[PDB]
Structures are given as C-alpha cells and as structure tokens.
C-alpha cells in the first residue's frame, strides 16, 4: 500500500556500466528529450482562434449579472433582499418601496462588479429566479465605475441576454 520511488541500485556488470558511460559520453537521454520535443513540433497545436473561436462553456457558467422579467414584461424581483443577505462580498445594495400599483419592487438594486466574487450564491438564493449570473464574460471596461452596476444596467443586461439566459436556465433548472 506504499511504494518506494528511487530505491534502485544500478547493476554493476560491464554491460550496464558501459551503457551508463555511453549515456554519459554520448548523451543518449538528451537526444531522447530532443526527440520528445521534436515529436511535439509535428503535432497540431491546441490554439483556438480567439475571438473568432471561443472557449467551450457550460450552461452553469457564472458570468455577468442580469435581472430577469416574467413572460409578461413584469420584472421578477420582489425586493426580498435574500441575494444581498447571502452575498459573501456584500456586493448587492437594495432599497425598496411600494410603487404606484402597490407592488413590492426595488428602487435601488446595485451590484458592485468589483466587489463581486462571481460565486452565484445570489442566483441560487433568489426565490423567483430574478437575479441571475449570465453567460457574458466579455465586459471589461476602461473605467472603474462602469463596473458599478445599478438597477438600470442590470435590467438592460436581462433584456440584452434573456434569449440566452432563458435557455441556460431551461437546460439547468432540473439540476437545481
């Protein structure tokens, strides 16, 4: 149930001693290493042609945050603040009020994407599937505060990516 790496005594007959001295003077293992590197020279490389080719992802992927709506246009979020209670980085800032039809909706929904650790606890704490962490990972900015998302940017990410977020949640809700 254990084994000894490097517990070999080399043989001391003239055959093995001459083999080791030919290895020493004639560099046999170095030609072995050159041959392994030349063997990789004639392989097709693993390089994909980004951005025209993309790295493979799963529908579980945790990328850019988005707020979803129902199939009537009403937003799913009912301001329950479970996502900001569970948030390990305290990246979510929620303020709410009853709006003009008495619905329980948010007035503030901020996600700091520079505090966010992209762990997806908010999407799995959400009881109505409102906050989701979508498929987009290509959202680098030139400014720090362009990553300080408010409710408008998150609802626009939902409206932007809903055709894909709905299919990822369709492919992955039965594992949840």
């Amino acid at each position: 149930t254990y084994k000894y790496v490097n517990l070999r005594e080399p043989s001391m007959d003239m055959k093995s001693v001459t083999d080791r001295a030919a290895q020493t003077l004639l560099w046999t293992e170095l030609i072995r290493g050159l041959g392994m590197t030349l063997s990789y020279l004639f392989r097709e490389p693993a390089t994909i042609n980004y951005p025209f080719e993309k790295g493979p992802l799963s529908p579980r992927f945790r990328g850019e945050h988005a707020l979803r709506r129902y199939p009537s246009g009403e937003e799913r979020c009912i301001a329950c603040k479970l996502c900001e209670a569970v948030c390990p980085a305290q990246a979510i800032t929620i303020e709410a009020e009853p709006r003009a039809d008495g619905s329980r909706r948010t007035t503030r929904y901020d996600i700091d994407m520079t505090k966010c650790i992209y762990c997806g606890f908010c999407q799995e704490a959400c009881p109505v599937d409102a906050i989701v962490e979508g498929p987009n990972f290509e959202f680098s900015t030139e400014t720090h505060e362009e990553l300080l998302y408010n409710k408008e940017k998150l609802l626009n990410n939902g409206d932007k990516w809903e055709a894909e977020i709905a299919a990822n949640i369709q492919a992955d809700y039965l594992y949840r």
Partner: protein
C-alpha cells in the same frame, strides 16, 4: 489542466473557485455526460505524465 478546468466549469460554473463542495454534500449534481469526459481525460492522461 485546461480540460480539468472545463470539468470544474461544467460541474459548478466557475473554472477555479467553484464553491462546489459544501457542508452537507455538494451544491449540485453532476451534469449528464460529465463522467464520460472525465473518463476520456483519465484514459489519456498517463501518456502526458509519461512524456513529462
């Protein structure tokens, strides 16, 4: 190592920091077809160790 990060991304959605193994079990079950790809990785990984 990139293929094993694909295994982490398929099982959790993050390539490195999965937050997958949780107290009480794991967060989510294996997606269908994951263990076949873990088999196809492991069947060929010995030659990679051999050439290292």
């Amino acid at each position: 190592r990139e293929k094993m990060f694909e295994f982490y991304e398929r099982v959790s959605g993050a390539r490195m920091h999965a937050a997958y193994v949780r107290p009480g079990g794991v967060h989510q079950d294996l997606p269908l077809g994951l263990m076949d790809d873990i088999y196809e990785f492991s069947k060929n990984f010995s030659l990679r160790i051999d050439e290292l």
